[PDB]
Amino acid sequence: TKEERVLLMKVAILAIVAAKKGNTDEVRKALELALLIAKVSGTTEAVKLALEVVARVAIEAARRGNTDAVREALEVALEIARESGTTEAVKLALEVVARVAIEAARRGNTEAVVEALLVALEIAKESGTEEAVRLALEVVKRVSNEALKQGNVDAVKVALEVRKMIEELSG
Amino acid sequence: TKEERVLLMKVAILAIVAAKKGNTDEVRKALELALLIAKVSGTTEAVKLALEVVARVAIEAARRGNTDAVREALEVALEIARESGTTEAVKLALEVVARVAIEAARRGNTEAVVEALLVALEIAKESGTEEAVRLALEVVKRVSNEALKQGNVDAVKVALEVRKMIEELSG
Amino acid sequence: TKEERVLLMKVAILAIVAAKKGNTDEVRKALELALLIAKVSGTTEAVKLALEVVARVAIEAARRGNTDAVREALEVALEIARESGTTEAVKLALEVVARVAIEAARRGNTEAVVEALLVALEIAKESGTEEAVRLALEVVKRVSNEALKQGNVDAVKVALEVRKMIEELSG
Amino acid sequence: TKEERVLLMKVAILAIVAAKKGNTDEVRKALELALLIAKVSGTTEAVKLALEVVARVAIEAARRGNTDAVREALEVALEIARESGTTEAVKLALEVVARVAIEAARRGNTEAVVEALLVALEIAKESGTEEAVRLALEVVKRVSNEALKQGNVDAVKVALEVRKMIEELSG
Amino acid sequence: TKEERVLLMKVAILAIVAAKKGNTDEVRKALELALLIAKVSGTTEAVKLALEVVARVAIEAARRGNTDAVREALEVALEIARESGTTEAVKLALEVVARVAIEAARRGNTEAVVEALLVALEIAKESGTEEAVRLALEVVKRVSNEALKQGNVDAVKVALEVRKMIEELSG
Amino acid sequence: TKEERVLLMKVAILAIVAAKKGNTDEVRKALELALLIAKVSGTTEAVKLALEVVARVAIEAARRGNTDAVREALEVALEIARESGTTEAVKLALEVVARVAIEAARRGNTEAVVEALLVALEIAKESGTEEAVRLALEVVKRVSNEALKQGNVDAVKVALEVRKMIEELSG
């Protein structure tokens, strides 16, 4: 557990600096490594830690302006939850998305926010559960709330549309 | 004693220039030779001198940018202390790590710093003593302090995380 | 203590000049560094000093017209008090807010004043204590008093509304 | 003596041009070489000459805008005085700092001035003598006086704060 | 002493021309610089000279019609006396106020006169001495006398009210 | 002699055009080169020619509005006279100052005039002779006379104050 966490910390640091440099390719690799570490462990803790790694990278990438890296990280978050196959992991992945979109909205990176909002829906769709859908709606709410506080009306408008889309997907 | 010191001086000079050239393979060999010399002597002085050799090489390698050589040297420092099997040697090895990480942080080689900080923990873990743990925390402190003076916030952040990790390892 | 104070002084100077330049991004980083320094110290003095740094930056930013930097600094003031987790720190953070809003009102930066007044409420809310609420009301009073002396009726009107809102939040 | 002076002149010229080019790494090496030459000589004259080299480099670096090189040179000035271990050398090092900060203030490089002012304190602290403290205060005075003549109020304000800090360090 | 006076003369000239231009912001800065110069000197002479600077600026500003600059200068006069902490400085600051209000009344700038009359009271209040109160009443008298000579009945009426208010403040 | 004069002519032309462009940094260098040429020659003629160069640059800079360049040139004029160490050179430097201040007053650049008037005093102070003081007073007179002809009352007022200050400096 500890050793895995330490290695995941290494991955996070590398991917963050790579995103700051602009080396999105390296970021993608590191994000995959985070998944692979969690997969090798086969533990819920490792999965959560890997999702934490993804969050940190996407947040800093969004702050840097590296939306491409953010998009990849958001997809990886979903993939990690899918690999776990647990409701908890799905919720954690949605938490990752929330954190990224919130900080992106605060940064002004509305493009990253839009992507994250879409990913939130996709994560809930992958789960196929009412809970996941509700959690995704919570993610969207959080983004629009903090975006409204920031003044990022564009992000708020997008979030409102996505909120509807999530409900439509649920049916 | 004197002859051993002189031979260790030779090893240091060779490994330093090899690291500057980029010949990490040669550096690794020289680092092993330093250990072997100390082992043949079987004295605390020789062990300390060998650790001094390692320090010099890793410091100059970090300044050169040869992080790979630094990583190896840091591991060798631990191995030397392990071969001695003394608390003093452990402390001296931690001193080596401190020197490298401090100069690396001043150089801007945060990657080398991160590795050195992890090695500091590993050295304390190998000892398995409260003193060694405290000494490792002192190493981390020194790095973060000097890094803060340099302006290397990245190294400071890493050091803070490692400080926690060391305490966690102690329990 | 001294070394931390000196480093915090460095942070203040940098953030102030960055705000004057218009580099709000750099200001945000410096404000975070102030917090990090206080966190590393773990002392009430360091926390107070970090809040002093924030005050200086926000005041000069308000004078410059960099309201964005002011808003960030005001939030950081709260965060510093939250990190401390002490009533004193909360009071000190409210003192920071007061200083900024007063000077902003004197400058004519009513927008910054409005934000600061809201933050005062938020700080009291974060504390969740009657004392903090009363202190926040004192902050609002000070602003409206000095604004009235300046002639900034707009700031006075806003302060009066916020005063009510604070009382409403207390209940 | 003469030969050492001539070699120190070579070092000065190289470091100055390197600083103008932007090769701070080369400057750092040259600054170390100046120290090494003085150390090999083992004379007060050589020490003074090495400090003169440092002054010239830092002054031209400050004029160029290479504050990083200036910071290094200022530290080397201290180190040279420390290597000598004499009150005279300490005074001479403080003279070096004064010259740099004065010309930096005239240039407009307030950042370099701030660093130099801090170094002045550090030099006095390293000496640990009342005389050195007074000399450091003289350095600060000179900077603020000439900065006031230039119109560099920012440097003056910083100098005033440092003046206090020096007195505080003395106690 | 001489150098400080010369620098204060520079400040005066700049602030006067800035007030004539309408750059009140620059005037405020220059007024602060006058204070800072006196503070750095730490002499009664420098304090008096700084108050002379303030007087000149406020007088010319009142003649120009820049009442805003006058108000600031009047406040600075008080602050200078406060920084000195001497009865003499308080008297000198009241002399500054008198000069401004008298010339403003002669100019026809009754608004500036009203402000100056209020400041006279505030200065006496800050001192907290019977002498200062009497001196403030002398200031008011001088204004009303010269205003009556000019024909500025409005200023006279205001002065009479302020005279009462000063006595009321004394009690 | 001739070759030096021709090179000084080159320097003048370059510095003048640089001042017109706004490249004050280049002007400062060229002004130093003028001094260096005179120093290399070691003749009174070369010194006079270098002062002529300075005059031309400062005059055109004042006409352009580049007061910063003028201030530097005025200081260089003093430095040239100081390097010579002769009464004649001092007188010539004062002549340079006169020419600049007169043309600046005619241009309307009162700020440049004020600086030049102060420099005139400083030149006389550097000489430390009664003759130099009298010559400096002559410089001030010339400026006020021509300024009065132009209508530049501001320059006249300043000149009158400086005239006193010069007499005060003499004692």
DSSP, residue by residue, C91-120:
HHHHHHHHHHHHHHHHHT-HHHHHHHHHHH
Read off the tokens for F119. 């420099």
Query: Any CB–CB contact under 8 A between E34 and chain D?
Result: no
Chain E: touching chains (3 or more CB pairs < 8 Å)? D, F
- Per the CB < 8 A criterion, the answer to whether A16 and A53 are in contact is no
- Partners of C3 on chain B (C-beta within 8 Å) are 145
Burial class of residue D3 (count of CB atoms within 10 Å of its CB; 0-12, 13-18, 19+): exposed
Q: Which of A2, A9, A17 sits opposite B161 (nearest CB)?
A: A9
- Partners of D160 on chain E (C-beta within 8 Å) are 40
The one-character DSSP state at D27 is H
Query: Any CB–CB contact under 8 A between E20 and chain F?
Result: no
Helices (H), chain D: 2-21, 24-41, 44-64, 67-84, 87-107, 110-127, 130-150, 153-170
- Per the CB < 8 A criterion, the answer to whether F4 and F41 are in contact is yes
- Per the CB < 8 A criterion, the answer to whether B93 and B78 are in contact is yes
Instruction: Characterize B15-36 residue by residue with b for buried, 16 or more Cβ atoms within 10 angstroms of its Cβ, and e for exposed.
Output: bbebbbeebbebbbebbebbbe
Q: How many CB atoms lie within 10 A of CB B88?
A: 12
- Per the CB < 8 A criterion, the answer to whether E110 and E98 are in contact is no
Burial class of residue D153 (count of CB atoms within 10 Å of its CB; 0-12, 13-18, 19+): middle
Place of tokens 């009513």: C110
- Per the CB < 8 A criterion, the answer to whether D152 and D114 are in contact is no
Radius of gyration of chain D (CA): 15
- Per the CB < 8 A criterion, the answer to whether C93 and C52 are in contact is no
Looking from the CA of F105 toward its CB, the CA atoms found within 13 Å total 32
Burial class of residue F3 (count of CB atoms within 10 Å of its CB; 0-12, 13-18, 19+): exposed
Contact F114 E6 (CB under 8 A): no
F abuts C (3+ Cβ pairs < 8 Å): no
Q: How many CB atoms lie within 10 A of CB F148?
A: 14
- Partners of E37 on chain D (C-beta within 8 Å) are 148
Return residues 102-121 of B near A (CB < 8 Å): 114, 118
Chain F: touching chains (3 or more CB pairs < 8 Å)? E
What is the identity of the amino acid at D37? I
Return residues 36-75 of D near C (CB < 8 Å): none
The CA distance from A104 to A106, in Å, is 5
Closest CA to D54 of D37, D43, D111: D37
The CA distance from A28 to A71, in Å, is 10
Task: Report the Cα B148 to chain-centroid distance in Å.
Answer: 20
Polymer length of chain D: 171
Q: φ, ψ for residue E128 (rounded to 5)?
A: 80, 25
Q: Which residue of A has its CA nearest to B118?
A: A6
E101 Cβ contact list (under 8 Å, min separation 6)? E112, E113, E116, E117, E120, E139, E142, E143, E155
Instruction: Characterize E62-75 residue by residue with b for buried, 16 or more Cβ atoms within 10 angstroms of its Cβ, and e for exposed.
Output: bbbbbbbbbbbbbb
Q: How many CB atoms lie within 10 A of CB C129?
A: 14
E53 Cβ contact list (under 8 Å, min separation 6)? E8, E9, E11, E12, E15, E31, E34
Q: Left, alpha or beta for C36 (phi > 0: left; psi -120 to 50: alpha)? A: alpha
Query: Any CB–CB contact under 8 A between D159 and chain C?
Result: no
Read off the tokens for B91. 């402390």
Read off the tokens for E124. 């006496």
Q: Which residue of D has its CA nearest to C13?
A: D158
The CA distance from B51 to B37, in Å, is 11
The CA distance from C93 to C75, in Å, is 10
Place of tokens 């008297």: E91
- Partners of C13 on chain D (C-beta within 8 Å) are 114, 158
From residue C123, give the alpha-carbon distance in Å to each of C88, C94, F6: 12, 7, 72
The CA distance from A19 to D47, in Å, is 47
Place of tokens 């640059």: F57
**E strand intervals along chain A:** none
Q: How many CB atoms lie within 10 A of CB C139?
A: 32
The CA distance from B152 to A18, in Å, is 17
Q: How many CB atoms lie within 10 A of CB D77?
A: 32
The CA distance from E123 to D168, in Å, is 33
Contact C33 B153 (CB under 8 A): yes
Place of tokens 């000496």: D127
Helix H, strand E, coil C: the string for B72-118 is HHHHHHHHHHHHHCCHHHHHHHHHHHHHHHHHHHHHCCHHHHHHHHH
**E strand intervals along chain F:** none
Query: Any CB–CB contact under 8 A between C13 and chain D?
Result: yes
From residue A170, give the alpha-carbon distance in Å to each of A77, A94, A114, A167, E27: 21, 16, 20, 5, 65
From residue A5, give the alpha-carbon distance in Å to each of A51, A87, B32, D43: 11, 22, 30, 56
Query: Any CB–CB contact under 8 A between A13 and chain B?
Result: yes
- How was it solved? cryo-EM
A abuts B (3+ Cβ pairs < 8 Å): yes
- Per the CB < 8 A criterion, the answer to whether B113 and B143 are in contact is yes
Read off the tokens for D80. 């040279």
Tell me, in Å, the resolution of the deposited structure: 5.9
From residue C129, give the alpha-carbon distance in Å to each of C88, C136, D89: 12, 11, 58
Q: Left, alpha or beta for F120 (phi > 0: left; psi -120 to 50: alpha)? A: alpha
- Partners of D149 on chain E (C-beta within 8 Å) are 7
The one-character DSSP state at E22 is T
CA distance B50 to chain C (A): 34
